[PDB]
Design a binder for this molecule. Structure first.
Ligand SMILES: CCCc1c(C(=O)Nc2cccc(S(=O)(=O)N3CCCCCC3)c2)[nH]c(C)c1C(C)=O
Length: 127
């Protein structure tokens, strides 16, 4: 019941690239979700200690959050757009796994997920 270390946000060994799709993911997709009213629960990694959820990291073995995703884009962690899209999807999947239907957190996640899918459908053409 101690928090795990947050996911890695910068790796010296990995090669670094800037693409329009990556610009769009940080600049449009991340920013739109970050500004949203329901954003706060997904803005940082779930703090199991502070929120007193002992079972959360036993159930969820691949934690992800928008704060982490924002840092990865900002640190040029992702070579590919799909890597970032996968992280968004993992964050939503985690919420649904841990939480029951009708929970406030699940409803918020669905709204964010819905908006995310709309923006991702507008993803710019790759190089
Ligand atoms: C049962 C919901 C728990 C949860 C959050 C969450 O963030 N909930 C939260 C609740 C209360 C306050 C704050 S908080 O942001 O205001 N806050 C101040 C309090 C103590 C430190 C923490 C930060 C955050 N997000 C996800 C994805 C989940 C789960 C389990 O799926």
């Amino acid at each position: 019941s101690m928090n795990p270390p947050p996911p890695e946000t910068s790796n010296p060994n990995k090669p670094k690239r800037q693409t329009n799709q990556l610009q769009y993911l940080l600049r449009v997709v991340l920013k739109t979700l970050w500004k949203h009213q329901f954003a706060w629960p997904f803005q940082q990694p779930v703090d199991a200690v502070k929120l007193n959820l002992p079972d959360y990291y036993k159930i969820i073995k691949t934690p992800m959050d928008m704060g982490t995703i924002k840092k990865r884009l900002e640190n040029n962690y992702y070579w590919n757009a799909q890597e970032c899209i996968q992280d968004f999807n993992t964050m939503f999947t985690n919420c649904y796994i841990y939480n029951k239907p009708g929970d406030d957190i699940v409803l918020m996640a669905e709204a964010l997920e819905k908006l995310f899918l709309q923006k991702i459908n507008e993803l710019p053409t790759e190089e």
